[PDB]
């Protein structure tokens, strides 16, 4: 029955494999989008108010149902056809499906003359579709079906195709809503502040933040204030309580202080009462609120109405926005004050801003919902204006012409295309970085980009606290994978078994709590709240309970049986403070864990047995979760959980550590993400090395996707001979690194050989490189289109001619065909022409606008595709193919942060060799190891020697006590090798033995995208910028290198004044001006007629020539634009 330790390493990984058979790696994206389409769009459409318009006749126009068909495309003839994602990629279409809404317009004029007209399936917009979602044509297709459609079966999906560009929505971090968080700002007028970003269940407005603060000590005592929304002045809490109908001080403290035996709380609230005694009735308090507001009505009536509306709608919407909810709002605001007092009295800890239990991940669904709310509101507005301008004339109108569908369509398309998350007009208030271009450089880069999280703290911020790896990231975020540049700690990555909750309605839970012995908050007396336990659901205090323990037992049993409580519902019992917080909302990152009985796992051997035959008896992960054996625990419920790292922790020990565990890790290696799960032995490296590899696995070459032959990507690198690593971890089985690997096993020798590998460099074998070692192919796609925008000027693909075309370069166009397009198989060098495009003029009647190769490439045309774009003019894509043979300067890396460029390449006779004539493919310098402490590199090399000599694949899973260095060495000594991986090598040049026995063996190396040929650049009098006549910027522009301020300072320190003048004047922008010797302002010179005159001074004899930079002339002219007179006085 029990899984014994000897079977555990199989059982756990069997369980893990079942998880990845059920979910995958992009499950969060697909589930978010599915919830958005199934629920969020319908909720948004129904939550909009019916637009009642009347001059008389009236019309309501109620939207009642939505229909999202499959993705289709409409040609110029208008025939709807099912559009495949690959066709969208090739034709630069948007993989979107039409959204139709049912509309009901009832005519009501007078005399009960009512009649309803329903417009079924009114086309309301087009919604882009996430690939492999339920509403994707690739849904449920087999691998054969996907291959029939020219799709990769290993492609995870989880992205959109907008204008042929694959866009991926990055999950955005945000502070959780409807939760009270008591912080303390050191530099502020308030000692303590308790904030609550409140938002109603079905979002319709932004988060309304309410603060309840305490004024810092230094009138008599500490005063509690409340910064309500839409009010620009602090308001005493007692005033707010009275404005809600609680005038008696006893009632207010009944709502705030639940234990009247506690004078500390009492004296700390007393200043607030003493400050609010002149105001003693609800109307006066409402008038005070309205007066403190930023729109103080001259008459107290409208002041009181405004205060009523604010306290009913903007104050704590999550508690309830309807009327008669003042009791719930009073209880909740009293809870906020109670929490603030507990913090000020030291009875509760301040809340941690960085705790991921306090955060939420805004995924594709809830982000598209924000867009859709804004866009549907704008659409209903436009419909209101259109219908109003017609009914004002007293006649009917056609809603089909009122609905301008471009709002929703173009809005979603623009937002996903650019990443600016918001309305196109508010292009600066909008937050960019959402919806990035999917990284297709290697399969690991694609997976990681699809599992990418973002902390929008702002890269400019230099506070390290949000960048720090918090304790609560354990199991939810990769500890290693993070960019090492300016976004350290802000851009994160999901751990492998991390699941972001999609969201759920609290209705069944609340109903069960009602049927259960919970007492509502309006029905109780406050005297009961002392000993009772509060119950919050999605932040709303809904009631109280008397035995929280057996309530938690009941709820956990219900969630483990897949009863009314769904698996993703978090249920935290804080014991010391008697809250029970239940969460069903979306964005809660959680992970699966094995539940533990008294001191035993519930995962018995029968579950492993049924999981082994997963493909026959359809016993899956969901059956494991439904059995009550596995549980999803979120960051906030982990605080109440006692984990076992392994079932070995559940053994009874000579001194028991815990003996009351509640859960167990499925495997600790699941704390790593996609790119860190490729590192072998990451627990033997320094952690920065693991981070650098997690970044560098994403630039590694491989086969980024199986269907690369049909993709017209702008840039693509494919390795000739990718190999799976000889030394692998058990997590790559689910990353599909074995099916799409990104490196080669290289016989690497760590040695000092000729000095060409010093300081992070490598010596490669020229003979191996000749045999296809780390050879790659680079595919570059050029796009072009001939626009017939108007009869004024039209472009067209056609072989240009020297007699008709004007802007025709001296390059030869013979490689083009009469259609103007080069043919596949044609070898093209730099500056060559691949598309001959000519544009009609207003060298006559047509000008050359041909597409050249990006300079200095020298490839062969791989293929040419011709089609029609969305509007329907001819559209061409040409993929050119360039074989990249590794060379000096190309960057290579192992899986341990050990990067370096090729210093030199030696032939096989020049490389050092073992007694059996094995030469290293790569030689790396021993000095790269000691400071870096990448012992995982050495253990991987030794394990790889054992694996190659044994005919197996080494197990480098991080935390594995069945694999240590002594075992690997003992294994290697059985194959006739030195047990530590050393060998006697001979000098290739002289054949003499090397005195020091070299450490050599197979290690998995990666070829990175950074090849020297894509970086080398030179300039000598090339093109210049228009504004300031200085060299351009970039290799692509044939630009010059920037001689910056620091270079100026260095050369000033050198004392090299002529070199400094050459760099900053003569090699950048030499220029001449003519200055009036009297006024010092630039004069008018006419060198052809030799007439120089200053219009200002009315002189034409006292002019002087001045040699100045063009940028300085431009500066002085831009100062004269500002009415400044910079007078260059030559005397």
């Amino acid at each position: 029955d029990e899984i014994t330790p000897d079977l555990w390493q199989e059982a756990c990984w069997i369980v893990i494999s079942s998880y990845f058979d059920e979910k995958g790696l992009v499950r969060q994206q697909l589930d978010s989008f599915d919830e958005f389409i199934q629920m969020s769009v319908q909720r948004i459409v129904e939550d909009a108010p019916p637009i009642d318009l009347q001059a008389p006749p009236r019309y309501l126009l109620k939207f009642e149902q939505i229909y999202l068909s499959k993705p289709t495309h409409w040609e110029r003839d208008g025939a709807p056809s099912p559009m495949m994602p690959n066709e969208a990629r090739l034709r630069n279409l948007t993989y979107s499906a039409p959204l139709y809404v049912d509309i009901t317009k009832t005519v009501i004029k007078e005399g009960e003359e009512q009649l309803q007209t329903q417009h079924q399936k009114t086309f309301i917009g087009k919604i882009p579709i996430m690939l492999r979602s339920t509403y994707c044509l690739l849904n449920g297709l087999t691998d054969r079906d996907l291959c029939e459609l020219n799709e990769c079966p290993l492609d995870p999906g989880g992205y959109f195709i907008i204008n042929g560009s694959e866009k991926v929505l990055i999950a955005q971090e945000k502070m959780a809503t409807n939760t009270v968080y008591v912080f303390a700002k050191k530099d502020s007028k308030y000692a303590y502040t308790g904030e609550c970003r409140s938002c109603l269940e079905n979002s319709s407005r932004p988060t309304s933040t309410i603060w309840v603060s305490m004024l810092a000590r230094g009138a008599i005592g500490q005063r509690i204030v409340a910064t309500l929304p839409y009010i620009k002045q602090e308001v005493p809490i007692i005033i707010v309580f009275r404005a809600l109908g609680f005038v008696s001080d006893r009632d207010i403290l009944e709502h705030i202080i639940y234990d009247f035996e506690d004078p500390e709380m009492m004296e700390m609230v007393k200043p607030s009462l003493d400050e609010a005694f002149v105001i003693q009735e609800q109307n006066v308090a409402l008038n005070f609120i309205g007066s403190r507001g930023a729109k103080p009505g001259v008459t107290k009536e409208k002041r009181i109405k405004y205060a009523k509306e604010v306290l009913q709608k903007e104050m704590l919407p999550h508690v309830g926005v309807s009327d008669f909810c003042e009791t719930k709002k009073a209880y909740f605001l009293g809870y906020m004050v109670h929490r603030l007092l507990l913090a000020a009295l030291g009875r509760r800890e301040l809340d941690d801003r960085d705790h991921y239990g306090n955060k939420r991940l805004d995924l594709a669904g809830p982000l598209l919902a924000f867009l859709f709310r804004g866009m549907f509101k704008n659409l209903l507005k436009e419909v209101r204006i259109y219908a109003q301008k017609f009914i004002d004339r007293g006649k009917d109108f056609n809603l089909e012409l009122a609905i301008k569908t471009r709002i929703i369509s173009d809005g979603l398309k623009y937002s996903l295309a650019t990443g600016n998350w918001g309305d196109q007009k508010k292009a600066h208030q909008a937050r960019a970085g959402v919806s990035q271009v999917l990284n297709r450089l290697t399969f690991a880069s694609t997976l990681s980009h699809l599992r990418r999280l973002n902390s929008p703290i702002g890269r400019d911020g230099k506070l390290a606290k949000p960048r720090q790896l918090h304790n609560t990231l354990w199991g939810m975020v990769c500890p290693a994978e993070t960019p090492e540049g300016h976004a350290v700690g802000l851009v994160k990555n999901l751990a492998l078994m991390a699941y972001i909750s999609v969201g759920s309605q609290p209705s069944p839970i609340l109903e069960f709590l009602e049927e259960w012995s919970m007492e509502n908050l309006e029905e109780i007396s406050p005297a009961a709240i002392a000993d009772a336990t509060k119950i919050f659901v999605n932040g709303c205090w809904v009631g109280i309970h008397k035995d929280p323990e057996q309530l938690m037992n009941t709820l956990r049993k219900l969630r483990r049986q897949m009863d009314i409580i769904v698996s993703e519902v978090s249920m935290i019992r804080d014991i010391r403070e008697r809250e029970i917080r239940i969460y069903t909302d979306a964005g809660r990152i959680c992970r699966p864990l094995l539940i533990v009985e008294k001191q035993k796992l519930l995962l018995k051997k029968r579950h492993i047995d049924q999981l082994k035959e997963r493909e026959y008896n359809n016993y899956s992960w969901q059956d494991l979760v439904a059995s009550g054996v596995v549980e999803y625990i979120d960051t906030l419920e982990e605080e109440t959980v006692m984990l076992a790292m392994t079932p070995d922790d559940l053994q009874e020990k000579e001194v028991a550590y815990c003996s009351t565990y509640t859960h167990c890790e499925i495997h600790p290696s699941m704390i790593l993400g996609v790119c860190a799960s490729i590192i072998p032995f990451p627990d033997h490296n320094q952690s920065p090395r693991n981070t650098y590899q997690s970044a560098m696995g994403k630039q590694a070459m491989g086969v980024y996707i199986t269907n690369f032959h049909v993709r017209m990507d702008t840039l693509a690198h494919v390795l000739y001979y990718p190999q799976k690593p000889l030394v692998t971890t058990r997590s790559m089985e689910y990353l599909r690194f074995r099916e799409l690997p990104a490196g080669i096993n290289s016989i690497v020798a760590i040695a000092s050989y000729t000095g060409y590998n010093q300081e992070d460099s490598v010596i490669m074998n020229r003979s191996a490189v000749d045999r296809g070692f780390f050879r790659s192919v680079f595919y570059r796609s050029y796009k072009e289109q001939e626009s017939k925008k108007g009869f004024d000027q039209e472009e067209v693909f056609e072989k240009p001619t020297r007699e008709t075309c004007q802007g025709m370069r001296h390059a030869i166009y013979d490689k083009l065909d009469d259609d103007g397009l080069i043919a596949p198989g044609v070898r093209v060098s730099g500056d060559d022409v691949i598309i001959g495009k000519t544009v009609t003029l207003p060298r006559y009647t047509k000008r050359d606008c041909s597409t050249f190769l990006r300079t200095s490439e020298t490839g062969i045309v791989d293929q040419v595709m011709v089609t029609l774009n969305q509007e329907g003019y001819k559209f061409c894509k040409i993929r050119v193919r360039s074989v990249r043979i590794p060379q000096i300067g190309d960057k290579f890396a192992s899986r341990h942060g050990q990067k370096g460029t090729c210093g030199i390449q030696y032939r096989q006779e020049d490389m050092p060799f073992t007694c059996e004539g094995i030469t290293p493919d790569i030689i790396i310098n021993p000095h790269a190891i000691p400071s870096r402490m990448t012992i995982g590199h050495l253990i991987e090399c030794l394990q790889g020697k054992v694996s190659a000599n044994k005919g197996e694949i080494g197990d480098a899973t991080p935390f594995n006590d069945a694999v240590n260095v002594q075992k690997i060495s003992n294994l290697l000594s059985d194959y006739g090798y030195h047990l530590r991986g050393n060998e006697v090598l001979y000098n290739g040049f002289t054949g003499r033995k090397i005195t020091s026995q070299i450490f050599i063996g197979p290690t998995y190396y990666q070829r990175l995208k950074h090849m020297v040929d894509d970086k080398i650049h030179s300039r000598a009098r090339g093109p210049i910028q228009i504004l300031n006549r200085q060299p351009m910027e970039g290799r692509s522009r044939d630009g010059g290198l920037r001689f910056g301020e620091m270079e100026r300072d260095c050369q000033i320190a050198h004392g090299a004044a002529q070199f400094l003048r050459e760099r900053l004047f003569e090699a950048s922008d030499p220029y001449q001006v003519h200055v009036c010797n009297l006024c010092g302002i630039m004069a008018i010179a006419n060198t052809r007629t030799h007439t120089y005159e200053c219009r200002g001074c009315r002189n034409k004899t006292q002019i002087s020539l001045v040699r100045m930079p063009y940028a300085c002339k431009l500066l002085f002219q831009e100062l004269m634009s500002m009415s400044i007179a910079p007078r260059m006085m030559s005397v």
Partner: protein, 51 residues
């Protein structure tokens, strides 16, 4: 204070134990792109005509 300049080049750096400390190993393509305006004299008339 800082600006783009002509007669500049940039590429990846690489070790070379066989250069002196004051030498830099330059590719032939960078050197073929970059030029130095040498004044003609009877001392260099022949060499510069050769070039």
């Amino acid at each position: 204070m800082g600006k783009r300049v002509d007669f500049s080049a940039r590429t990846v750096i690489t070790p070379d134990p066989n250069l002196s400390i004051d030498q830099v190993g330059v590719p032939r393509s960078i050197a073929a792109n970059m030029t130095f305006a040498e004044i003609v004299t009877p001392f260099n008339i022949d060499r510069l005509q050769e070039l």
